Amino acid sequence: XEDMTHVPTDAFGKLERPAAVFNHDEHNEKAGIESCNACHHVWVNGVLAEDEDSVGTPCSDCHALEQDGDTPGLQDAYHQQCWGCHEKQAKGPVMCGECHVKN
Ligand code: HEM
Ligand code: HEM
Ligand code: HEM
Ligand code: HEM
Ligand SMILES: [As]
Ligand SMILES: [As]
Ligand SMILES: [As]
Ligand SMILES: [Zn+2]
Ligand SMILES: [Zn+2]
Ligand SMILES: [Zn+2]
Ligand SMILES: [Zn+2]
Numbered sequence: 001x002e003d004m005t006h007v008p009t010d011a012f013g014k015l016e017r018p019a020a021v022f023n024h025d026e027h028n029e030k031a032g033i034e035s036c037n038a039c040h041h042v043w044v045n046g047v048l049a050e051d052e053d054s055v056g057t058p059c060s061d062c063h064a065l066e067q068d069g070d071t072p073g074l075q076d077a078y079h080q081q082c083w084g085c086h087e088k089q090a091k092g093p094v095m096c097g098e099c100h101v102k103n
Contacts, residue, residue, distance in 0.1 A: 005022070007078065008060075040055045
């Protein structure tokens with residue numbers, strides 16, 4: 001993911017909003033995220049694996065557009081992960097057009 005500059009959007013089909021800005025490797029460095037499974041997590045039978053990750057598997061392989069039980073749909077998964085951390089840490093973009101940048 002060194003060439004990533006926005007979050008993948010093909011799984012959404014027609015977009016409402018601009019692709020979310022996300023230079024993956026520069027973001028993770030600036031945010032000080034060392035564990036890949038901060039995002040690329042492995043949930044099995046309601047248990048979060050502490051020492052595994054799902055690097056290489058798209059979020060959309062496990063997160064349909066619609067919610068399934070307590071597995072969030074794909075929009076909700078991104079918002080909870082991305083906007084959820086920014087709100088928890090009080091750092092990074094928490095307004096809609098600061099992620100979904102019109103440029
Ligand atoms: C989820 C894929 C996700 C997105 C999208 C996202 C975007 C984002 C931007 C565009 C910035 C500003 C520029 C930059 O890349 O530094 C930013 C900044 C921070 N983020 Fe973020 N972010 C996503 C996810 C996450 C997650 C899961 C965390 C916390 C675990 C996280 C944290 C942060 C932090 C901290 C910052 C500030 C960086 C700095 O300038 O200090 N983000 N994010
Ligand atoms: C930990 C250092 C880490 C690794 C390693 C890593 C790898 C990685 C790859 C190989 C991909 C796919 C790139 C491609 O398609 O060419 C990828 C994609 C995404 N990642 Fe990642 N990633 C690591 C860490 C993190 C962290 C900490 C976050 C959350 C802030 C994160 C996020 C994402 C997202 C979003 C994508 C796109 C997923 C998709 O659906 O294709 N990664 N990562
Ligand atoms: C891709 C980086 C990706 C994102 C974004 C994402 C988000 C996400 C959230 C925010 C939740 C809610 C719980 C939590 O905060 O962790 C969640 C829940 C589930 N996930 Fe996920 N997820 C991403 C990637 C993946 C991948 C690649 C898998 C499949 C291997 C996956 C699976 C799941 C499952 C299952 C859940 C539900 C957990 C539970 O409550 O039982 N995620 N995801
Ligand atoms: C502010 C409340 C806000 C809105 C509105 C919004 C909308 C939105 C939609 C409708 C989607 C689905 C795809 C589409 O464009 O149709 C979506 C997807 C993602 N979002 Fe978002 N979003 C708002 C807020 C935020 C913030 C503050 C962030 C960044 C932390 C963010 C990120 C993302 C990501 C990642 C996705 C999936 C990939 C993409 O579509 O770019 N959103 N959002
Ligand atoms: As670097
Ligand atoms: As929120
Ligand atoms: As809250
Ligand atoms: Zn390189
Ligand atoms: Zn851009
Ligand atoms: Zn750098
Ligand atoms: Zn790993």
